[PDB]
A paper describes a structure:
To improve binding to PCT64 bnAbs and rescue binding to PCT64 LMCA, we combined the enriched loop sequence from ApexGT1.B, the K169R mutation from ApexGT1A, and two naturally occurring mutations from the PCT64 donor, M161A and D167N (Landais et al., 2017). The resulting construct, ApexGT2, bound to PCT64 LMCA with a monovalent affinity of 167 nM and had 25-fold and 39-fold enhanced affinity for PG9 and PCT64.35K, respectively, compared to MD39. ApexGT2 also showed good thermal stability by differential scanning calorimetry (DSC), with a Tm of 71°, reduced by 6° from MD39 but still within the range for BG505 SOSIP.D664-based native-like trimers (Kulp et al., 2017; Sanders et al., 2013). Position 187 within Loop2b was not glycosylated in MD39 but was well occupied in ApexGT2 and composed mainly of complex-type glycans. Finally, using a subset of apex-unliganded trimers identified from the PCT64 35S complex dataset, we obtained a 2.7-Å-resolution reconstruction of ApexGT2 with unliganded trimer apex, from which we determined how each glycan was being displaced in the complex relative to its average apex-unliganded position. The conformation of Loop2B in both apo and PCT64-35-bound trimers, and the lack of clear map density for the N187 glycan, both suggest that the tip of the loop is predominantly oriented away from the 3-fold axis and that the glycan itself is highly flexible, consistent with the N187 glycan having negligible effect on KD.
Broadly neutralizing antibodies (bnAbs) to the HIV envelope (Env) V2-apex region are important leads for HIV vaccine design. Most V2-apex bnAbs engage Env with an uncommonly long heavy-chain complementarity-determining region 3 (HCDR3), suggesting that the rarity of bnAb precursors poses a challenge for vaccine priming. HCDR3s for these bnAbs mediate binding by reaching through the conserved glycan shield to contact a positively charged, semi-conserved protein surface on strand C of the V2 loop (Andrabi et al., 2015, 2017; Gorman et al., 2016; Landais et al., 2017; Lee et al., 2017; McLellan et al., 2011; Pancera et al., 2010, 2013; Pejchal et al., 2010; Sok et al., 2014). We then engineered ApexGT Env trimers that bound inferred germlines for PCT64 and PG9 and had higher affinities for bnAbs, determined cryo-EM structures of ApexGT trimers complexed with inferred-germline and bnAb forms of PCT64 and PG9, and developed an mRNA-encoded cell-surface ApexGT trimer.
Author numbering:
A (entry chain A): 33 to 57, 82 to 143, 152 to 309, 312 to 323, 323A, 324 to 397, 399, 412 to 457, ...
B (entry chain H): 1 to 52, 52A, 53 to 82, 82A, 82B, 82C, 83 to 100, 100A, ...
C (entry chain B), D (entry chain B), E (entry chain B): 518 to 544, 570 to 662
Write the structure that this text describes.
Amino acid sequence: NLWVTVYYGVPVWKDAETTLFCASDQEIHLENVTEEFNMWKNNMVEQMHEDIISLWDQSLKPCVKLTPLCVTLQCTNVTNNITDDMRGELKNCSFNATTELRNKRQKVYSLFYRLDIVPMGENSTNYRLINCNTSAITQACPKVSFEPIPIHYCAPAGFAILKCKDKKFNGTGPCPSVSTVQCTHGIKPVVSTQLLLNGSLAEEEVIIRSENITNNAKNILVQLNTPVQINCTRPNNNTVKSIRIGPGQAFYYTGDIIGDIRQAHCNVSKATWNETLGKVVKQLRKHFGNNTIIRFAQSSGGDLEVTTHSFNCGGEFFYCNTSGLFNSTWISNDSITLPCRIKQIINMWQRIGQAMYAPPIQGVIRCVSNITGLILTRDTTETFRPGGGDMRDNWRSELYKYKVVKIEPLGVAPTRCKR
Amino acid sequence: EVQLVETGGGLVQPGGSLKLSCRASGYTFSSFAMSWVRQAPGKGLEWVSLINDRGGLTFYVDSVKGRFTISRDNSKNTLSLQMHSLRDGDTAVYYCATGGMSSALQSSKYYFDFWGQGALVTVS
Amino acid sequence: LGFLGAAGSTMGAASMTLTVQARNLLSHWGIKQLQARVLAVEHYLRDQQLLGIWGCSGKLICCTNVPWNSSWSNRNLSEIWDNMTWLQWDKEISNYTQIIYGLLEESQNQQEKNEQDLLA
Amino acid sequence: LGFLGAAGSTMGAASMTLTVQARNLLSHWGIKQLQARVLAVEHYLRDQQLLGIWGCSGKLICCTNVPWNSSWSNRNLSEIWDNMTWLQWDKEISNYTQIIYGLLEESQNQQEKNEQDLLA
Amino acid sequence: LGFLGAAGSTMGAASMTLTVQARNLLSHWGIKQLQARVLAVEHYLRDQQLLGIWGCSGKLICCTNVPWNSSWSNRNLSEIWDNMTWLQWDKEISNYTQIIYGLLEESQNQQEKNEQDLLA
Ligand SMILES: *[C@@H]1O[C@H](CO)[C@@H](O[C@@H]2O[C@H](CO)[C@@H](O[C@@H]3O[C@H](CO)[C@@H](O)[C@H](O[C@H]4O[C@H](CO)[C@@H](O)[C@H](O)[C@@H]4O)[C@@H]3O)[C@H](O)[C@H]2NC(C)=O)[C@H](O)[C@H]1NC(C)=O
Ligand SMILES: *[C@@H]1O[C@H](CO)[C@@H](O[C@@H]2O[C@H](CO)[C@@H](O)[C@H](O)[C@H]2NC(C)=O)[C@H](O)[C@H]1NC(C)=O
Ligand SMILES: *[C@@H]1O[C@H](CO)[C@@H](O[C@@H]2O[C@H](CO)[C@@H](O)[C@H](O)[C@H]2NC(C)=O)[C@H](O)[C@H]1NC(C)=O
Ligand SMILES: *[C@@H]1O[C@H](CO)[C@@H](O[C@@H]2O[C@H](CO)[C@@H](O)[C@H](O)[C@H]2NC(C)=O)[C@H](O)[C@H]1NC(C)=O
Ligand SMILES: *[C@@H]1O[C@H](CO[C@@H]2O[C@@H](C)[C@@H](O)[C@@H](O)[C@@H]2O)[C@@H](O)[C@H](O)[C@H]1NC(C)=O
Ligand SMILES: *[C@@H]1O[C@H](CO[C@@H]2O[C@@H](C)[C@@H](O)[C@@H](O)[C@@H]2O)[C@@H](O)[C@H](O)[C@H]1NC(C)=O
Ligand SMILES: *[C@@H]1O[C@H](CO[C@@H]2O[C@@H](C)[C@@H](O)[C@@H](O)[C@@H]2O)[C@@H](O)[C@H](O)[C@H]1NC(C)=O
Ligand SMILES: *[C@@H]1O[C@H](CO[C@@H]2O[C@@H](C)[C@@H](O)[C@@H](O)[C@@H]2O)[C@@H](O)[C@H](O)[C@H]1NC(C)=O
Ligand SMILES: *[C@@H]1O[C@H](CO[C@@H]2O[C@@H](C)[C@@H](O)[C@@H](O)[C@@H]2O)[C@@H](O)[C@H](O)[C@H]1NC(C)=O
Ligand SMILES: *[C@@H]1O[C@H](CO[C@@H]2O[C@@H](C)[C@@H](O)[C@@H](O)[C@@H]2O)[C@@H](O)[C@H](O)[C@H]1NC(C)=O
Ligand SMILES: *[C@@H]1O[C@H](CO)[C@@H](O)[C@H](O)[C@H]1NC(C)=O
Ligand SMILES: *[C@@H]1O[C@H](CO)[C@@H](O)[C@H](O)[C@H]1NC(C)=O
Ligand SMILES: *[C@@H]1O[C@H](CO)[C@@H](O)[C@H](O)[C@H]1NC(C)=O
Ligand SMILES: *[C@@H]1O[C@H](CO)[C@@H](O)[C@H](O)[C@H]1NC(C)=O
Ligand SMILES: *[C@@H]1O[C@H](CO)[C@@H](O)[C@H](O)[C@H]1NC(C)=O
Ligand SMILES: *[C@@H]1O[C@H](CO)[C@@H](O)[C@H](O)[C@H]1NC(C)=O
Ligand SMILES: *[C@@H]1O[C@H](CO)[C@@H](O)[C@H](O)[C@H]1NC(C)=O
Ligand SMILES: *[C@@H]1O[C@H](CO)[C@@H](O)[C@H](O)[C@H]1NC(C)=O
Ligand SMILES: *[C@@H]1O[C@H](CO)[C@@H](O)[C@H](O)[C@H]1NC(C)=O
Ligand SMILES: *[C@@H]1O[C@H](CO)[C@@H](O)[C@H](O)[C@H]1NC(C)=O
Ligand SMILES: *[C@@H]1O[C@H](CO)[C@@H](O)[C@H](O)[C@H]1NC(C)=O
Ligand SMILES: *[C@@H]1O[C@H](CO)[C@@H](O)[C@H](O)[C@H]1NC(C)=O
Ligand SMILES: *[C@@H]1O[C@H](CO)[C@@H](O)[C@H](O)[C@H]1NC(C)=O
Ligand SMILES: *[C@@H]1O[C@H](CO)[C@@H](O)[C@H](O)[C@H]1NC(C)=O
Ligand SMILES: *[C@@H]1O[C@H](CO)[C@@H](O)[C@H](O)[C@H]1NC(C)=O
Ligand SMILES: *[C@@H]1O[C@H](CO)[C@@H](O)[C@H](O)[C@H]1NC(C)=O
Ligand SMILES: *[C@@H]1O[C@H](CO)[C@@H](O)[C@H](O)[C@H]1NC(C)=O
Ligand SMILES: *[C@@H]1O[C@H](CO)[C@@H](O)[C@H](O)[C@H]1NC(C)=O
Ligand SMILES: *[C@@H]1O[C@H](CO)[C@@H](O)[C@H](O)[C@H]1NC(C)=O
Ligand SMILES: *[C@@H]1O[C@H](CO)[C@@H](O)[C@H](O)[C@H]1NC(C)=O
Ligand SMILES: *[C@@H]1O[C@H](CO)[C@@H](O)[C@H](O)[C@H]1NC(C)=O
C-alpha cells in the first residue's frame, strides 16, 4: 500500500535556546506561517542582559582604581551664588592624596555632590566617600564613551530567528504574519528606568503589554506610537582638573564652577505629554473598566535609583523627579520642568560589590531624547505609578517581536514508492 | 468538462513521418500522466506510449520503441507524438488519453480517465 | 524561494525545496561562540549518521522497505501531500518517530546481510 | 608522489593523485588554534555536502548529466587534459563555477524525483 | 544488547551489532572539554573519509575486490568467525592493516577510472 519515505531538508522547526552572536558597525516572508510568540519567556532577553553587563565590566578593567581616595575628607559649604534648590547639594572637600611617589602627599580640594559623600560620627566637617565601607570605586576611563551603540543579534547555523510583523501584536499568542530573518535589527542598549528612551515606536496605536494584566505584581510596558521629546540640561559651567595619584594614574574632578549654581532639570512639552496620557488611558480602559477612573501617581518609595528617572545625559548620570508627569486623574507653549540630581558614584546594575566613579565633564551639558514608552505598575479607581528598576524590561521592549527556533530538517511521510 | 482534441495528421507514405498533437482543456494538464492508445480499423485497442506529468519519463510498446517519440508541453497544454518510418501496420486511429500513471505522492491510476476522439493516421 | 519560504506551503510543494534548507545547516568571550559552532557540527553529523544507518546516505529523498502502519496515521495521500504542511505533519506523528526510526534501522541491517551473501 | 606534487603536472596526470590531496584535508592562548580546527572541519563538511547535493557522495571522480557550454570554455580535450594544469584551468573558468554548480544541483533534483516515481 | 556488549562474543555474532557501536561514536576551564569534542569529531571524520576512499561510503558491511593474502592470516572461516572475537583478531593482524588499507585504496582508484570510461 504505502511505504515510509525519508526526506531531508524539510522546512520544520522547534522552539529552542542557543547562544546568539554579535554583529555591529536577509528577510523571508513565510507566506502561510502562523507562529506562537511569548515575550517574557524569550531567552534572547536573558542573553542580552548578561552580554551588556559583561561588556560593561570589561571596559573598566584597564581604568584607574580609586583606592588612594578612601581618606577622610574635610567638607565645607561652597562659596558661590547657590540658589535655593541647590542649597546643600555641593560640598567643597579637602583631602591629602597620594602622588606618583610613595613618600609624597598633595593637598587637593574638589567639589562633590552631597549624594556621593557621607558624614562620619555625625561630624559636619569630616566626610568619607559613599562606597569606602562596601567597595573599591573604579574610575571610568575618560576616553571611553557611554553611548548606546546598536547591537544586532545573529543566529548560528542550524537555527533561525523568526520575527512577528503584526502591528497590533501585544507580545503573546499567535502571530499571523511571520518572517524569517538572519539577524535582528540594531538594538540600542539604552539604560534608563521609568521612561524608555530612544526605542522603537508602535506603528499604529499605543500598545500595553503585561505578562498578566490583572496581576498587580507585574509591570506594564507601554509602547507609544508617537515620541515625546524631552530636553535635559545641567546648566553649570564645570572646570575640570586632574591630579596624579599614582604611576601614570590620573584622577579627574570638578575644581570649580564658573558663575551661579543652578539645578539640573528636564523639560517635557505640557501639551504633548497630556495627549500621550490620554492615549494611554484609552488603551488601559480596554483591560480595566470603561466607566472607570484612571489615576496617575508618583513612585511610592525606595531609593533614588528607583523613585526617579535615571539616565545618562552626555556622560553624566541624572536622577529626575517625574511627579510632574504622573500627577492627574482621568474620570470617564508650556512645558513641565522636572528637577534632577546628579551623582558621580553609581552602581549601574542592581549589584552590591561594584561601584564606578564617573569623572566630570568639562563645560555645560545638554541632551535631547525621545520618550518611546513607559514602565508602569498598578496598585473603583485604578492607580498607576512609574516602575522600571529592572533593566531586563528595557530589553523586552525591543526583543518582544523575535523568537529563536531550531531547524529540524529530517522527517518521514508515507508514499507509494518502495525500495 | 474535460476535453482532449487531436489535431494531428492524415495520409502519409510508408517509411515517412507524421506528427500528432492533442490540445487539452478543463483540467490541470500538469497534474496528469498521458498516453496514446491506438485502434486499427478492424481491431481493438492497443497501448502505444506513456508520458509522465512532468515530461521526464517515457515508456513505449516494443513495436514502436525505436520509432516513436512521446512528448509534452505543460505551458501550452499540449501532448504530442512524433512517428517515424511509418509501417503499413501503423494505420490506426490514435487516441489522446489521460491516465496510465501517477507520481508516488498521488493515488495511483493504472487506467485511462479521459479520451479524445482520435486522429486517423493512414499509411499507404 | 529562500530559506523556510515553503514552510507554509503543502508537503508536496515544500518537498521541492529540500536543497534550500540543507544548505543552511552549515555556516572567556568567544568561547560560547565556539561551543555553538562545535555543537552545530555535532548535530549535523548525527543526522547524517542516521541517514547512513538507514541506507539513505547521499540523498535528500530516500525510499525504504518499511511499510506504513495506519496506527501512525490513517490519512490518505491527498490529505497528506495536498494539505497538512510539514509543520502540521510533524506534530501529528511526533509520538511515532522513534518506532519508525527503529524499524528503518532494522530493515537496513537485514538488507546489508542479504546482499553480502548474494555477492558470495 | 606527495601532497601537491602533481600541481605542476597536466590535468590528466594530476587526476590520478586525488587521494593524495583528499587525505591531507583532515588533520586566551590556544583559542585561535581551536578556531582554526573548527573552521577546517566546517570547510570540509561544506564541500562534502555540496558533492552530496550534486549526487557525487562517496566518490572522487563523478560523471553527471550536465552538458558543457562552450561559452564556459571552447578548448578541446587535448588542450585541457594534455596541457592546462589544474591551476591554469581553475583561473580560466573561475567566472563560471557558480553557473555550473547551480546547474549540477538542478539536475540532481530532477533525477531524484524521476527515480522515486519509477520505484512507484 | 548495549554498547560493547558483544565485545566478548565471536566475530560472527558481534558483526550483528555494528549500529550499536556506530551510534556511540558521536555525543581556562572548559577549553580542554572543547578540545576533546573537536578531536572526537576529527577522529570520526577521518574514519568516514577513509571508508569513502575505499568505496564503502554509507555502509557498515562492505565487500571489496582485494583478495586475502594468507601471509596476513592463514586461519579458515570457522577459526575466524566462530572463534577469535574481534579483540583477538585485531591483535593477530595489527601488523598488516596498513598494507591492507593501501591495497583497498589502490583498488578503488582503478575501479573509478574503469567506470568513467564505460560511461564514455
Ligand atoms: C537619544 O538619541 C540622541 C540622538 O542620537 C542622543 O543625542 C546625542 O548625544 C551625543 C552624546 O552626548 C552627542 O554627541 C556629542 O556632541 C558634542 C557636541 O558637538 C561633542 O562635543 C561630543 O564629542 C566629545 O565627547 C565624545 C564622548 O562622548 C568624545 O569621543 C569626542 O572626542 C569629544 O570629546 C559628542 O560628539 C550628539 O550630538 C547628540 N545628538 C543630538 C542630535 O543632539 C541622546 O543622548 C540619546 N539619549 C539617551 C538617553 O541615550
Ligand atoms: C525649560 O523651561 C524653562 C522655563 O520654565 C526655561 O527657562 C528659561 O530659559 C531662558 C534662556 O533660554 C531664560 O531667558 C528664561 O528667563 C528662563 N525662564 C525661567 C522661568 O527660568 C529652560 O531654559 C528650559 N530648558 C532646558 C532643558 O534647557
Ligand atoms: C574651596 O575652598 C578653597 C580654599 O580652601 C578655595 O580656594 C581659595 O580661594 C581664595 C579666593 O577666594 C584664594 O585666595 C586662595 O588662594 C584659594 N586657595 C587654594 C588652596 O587654592 C576654593 O575656591 C573653594 N572652591 C569653590 C568651588 O568655591
Ligand atoms: C518629587 O517631588 C515631590 C514634591 O513635588 C515629593 O513629594 C513629597 O514627599 C513627601 C515625603 O518625603 C510628602 O510628605 C509630601 O506631601 C510630598 N509632596 C506632594 C506635593 O505630594 C517627592 O518625594 C519627590 N520625589 C523624589 C524621588 O525626590
Ligand atoms: C501496527 O501497530 C499496531 C498497534 O501497535 C501499537 O500501537 C502503535 C500506535 C504503537 O504505539 C505501537 O508501539 C503499539 O504496539 C500493531 O498491533 C500492528 O501489528 C502494527 N503493524 C505491523 C507492525 O505490522
Ligand atoms: C481521501 O480522503 C478524502 C477525505 O476523507 C474524509 O475526511 C478525512 C479527514 C477522514 O475523516 C476520512 O475518514 C473521511 O472519509 C476523501 O474525500 C477522498 O475521496 C479520499 N481519496 C481517495 C483516493 O480515497
Ligand atoms: C550557453 O551560454 C549561452 C550564453 O549564456 C551567457 O553567457 C555565459 C558565458 C554566461 O555568462 C551566462 O550566464 C549567459 O547567459 C546561452 O545563450 C546558451 O543558451 C547556453 N547553453 C545552454 C544553457 O544550452
Ligand atoms: C584540438 O585543438 C588543437 C589546437 O587548435 C588550435 O589552437 C587552439 C588554441 C584554438 O585557437 C583553436 O581554434 C585552433 O584551431 C588542434 O591542432 C587539434 O587538431 C584539435 N584536435 C581535435 C581532435 O580536433
Ligand atoms: C602475499 O605476501 C607475500 C609476502 O609478502 C611479504 O610478507 C608479508 C607478510 C608482508 O610483510 C609484505 O609486505 C611482504 O612483502 C608476497 O610475496 C605475495 O606476493 C603476496 N601476495 C600477493 C600480493 O599476491
Ligand atoms: C578449519 O580448521 C580446523 C582446524 O585446523 C587445525 O588447527 C588450526 C589452528 C591450524 O593449526 C590448522 O593447520 C590445523 O589443521 C579444521 O579442523 C577444519 O576441518 C577446517 N575446516 C575446513 C572446511 O577446512
Ligand atoms: C552673588 O550675589 C550677590 C548678591 O546679589 C552679588 O552682590 C554678587 O555680585 C554675586 N556674585 C557674582 C560673582 O556676581
Ligand atoms: C551649610 O549648608 C547647610 C545646608 O545643607 C546649612 O544648614 C548650614 O547652616 C550651612 N552652614 C554655613 C556655615 O553656612
Ligand atoms: C591633611 O594633612 C594635614 C597635615 O599635613 C592635616 O592637618 C589635615 O587635617 C589633613 N586633611 C584631612 C582631610 O585629613
Ligand atoms: C555603610 O554605612 C552606611 C551608613 O552610612 C550603611 O547604611 C551601610 O549598610 C554600610 N555598608 C556596609 C557594607 O556595612
Ligand atoms: C495579549 O493578547 C492575548 C491574545 O489575544 C490575550 O489573551 C492577552 O490577555 C493580551 N494581554 C494584554 C496585556 O493585552
Ligand atoms: C493572573 O493573575 C490572577 C490574579 O489577578 C490569577 O488569579 C490568575 O491565575 C493568573 N493567571 C495566570 C495564567 O497566571
Ligand atoms: C565656560 O567656560 C569656558 C572657559 O573654560 C568659556 O570659554 C565658555 O564660553 C563658558 N561657557 C558658558 C556657558 O559660560
Ligand atoms: C527641545 O529643544 C528643541 C530644539 O532642539 C525645541 O524645538 C523644543 O521645543 C524643546 N522642547 C521642550 C519641551 O522645551
Ligand atoms: C488634559 O486632558 C483633560 C481631558 O480632556 C483636560 O480636562 C485637561 O485640561 C488637559 N490638560 C492640559 C494641560 O491640556
Ligand atoms: C468603551 O468605550 C468606547 C468609546 O470610547 C467604545 O467604542 C467601546 O465599544 C466601549 N466598550 C465597551 C465594552 O463598552
Ligand atoms: C499635583 O497637582 C496639584 C494641583 O492640581 C498640586 O497642588 C500637587 O502638589 C501636585 N502633586 C505633586 C506630587 O506634584
Ligand atoms: C524622535 O523621533 C523622530 C521620528 O522618528 C526622529 O526623526 C528623531 O530623530 C527622534 N529623536 C531622537 C533624539 O532620536
Ligand atoms: C498560501 O495559501 C494560498 C491559498 O490561500 C496559496 O495560493 C499560496 O501559494 C500559499 N503560500 C505558500 C508559500 O505556499
Ligand atoms: C486536501 O485533502 C483532500 C482529501 O482529503 C484532497 O481532495 C485535496 O486534494 C487536498 N488539497 C486541496 C487542494 O484541498
Ligand atoms: C500522541 O501522544 C499524546 C500523549 O503524549 C496523546 O495525547 C495523543 O493522543 C497522541 N496522538 C497523536 C497526536 O498522534
Ligand atoms: C614538468 O615538465 C616536464 C617536461 O618539460 C615533464 O617531463 C615533467 O614530468 C613535468 N613535471 C610534473 C610534476 O609533471
Ligand atoms: C596540448 O594540446 C594539443 C592540442 O592543442 C595536443 O595536441 C597535445 O596533445 C597537448 N599536449 C601536448 C603533449 O603538448
Ligand atoms: C572573466 O571575468 C573577467 C571579469 O571579472 C573578464 O575580464 C574575463 O574576460 C572573463 N573571462 C575569462 C577569463 O574566462
Ligand atoms: C560467553 O561464552 C558462552 C559459552 O561459554 C556463550 O554461551 C555466551 O553467549 C558468550 N557471551 C557472549 C557475550 O557472547
Ligand atoms: C572454532 O574453530 C573450529 C575450526 O578451527 C570450528 O570447527 C568451530 O566451528 C569454531 N567454533 C566453535 C563453535 O568452537
Ligand atoms: C607482528 O609483528 C611483531 C613485531 O612487531 C612480530 O613479533 C610478530 O611475530 C608479528 N606477527 C603477528 C602477531 O602477526
